[PDB]
């Protein structure tokens, strides 16, 4: 099964990006909170010229999955661990809040 597909029923405005790690993806994250969705992992910074920037990752986006690992319930150590270990093209499910 696609272990991440359910995310698009819980967050139907979420989207999938494919970002190649070349040295880095180009993001930082925090464990934070948003009024509309609660606590979780959010993009907190974005590196100029990076592949994440080129793929349309935005500061403030909620990070919902990394490849096949769901990050809806991940703590900071686990989410950053997933991002650091991933190689090649890294699939991220992101939700821009607006």
């Amino acid at each position: 099964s696609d272990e991440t597909k359910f995310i698009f029923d819980q967050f139907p405005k979420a989207r999938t990006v494919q970002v190649r790690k070349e040295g880095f993806l180009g993001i930082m994250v925090i464990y934070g909170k948003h009024a509309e969705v609660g606590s979780g992992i959010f993009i907190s910074d974005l590196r100029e010229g990076s592949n994440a920037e080129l793929a349309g990752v935005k500061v403030g986006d909620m990070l919902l999955a990394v490849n096949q690992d769901v990050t809806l319930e991940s703590n900071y150590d686990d989410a950053t661990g997933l991002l650091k270990r991933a190689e090649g093209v890294v699939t991220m499910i992101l939700l821009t809040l607006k």
Binding site: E22, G23, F24, L25, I27, D45, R47, S50
Partner: peptide
Amino acid sequence: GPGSRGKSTVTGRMISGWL
């Protein structure tokens, strides 16, 4: 490879620690 330090879109500062 690309440098570990890069420009923050939030602060404009050159920082490391990129994922």
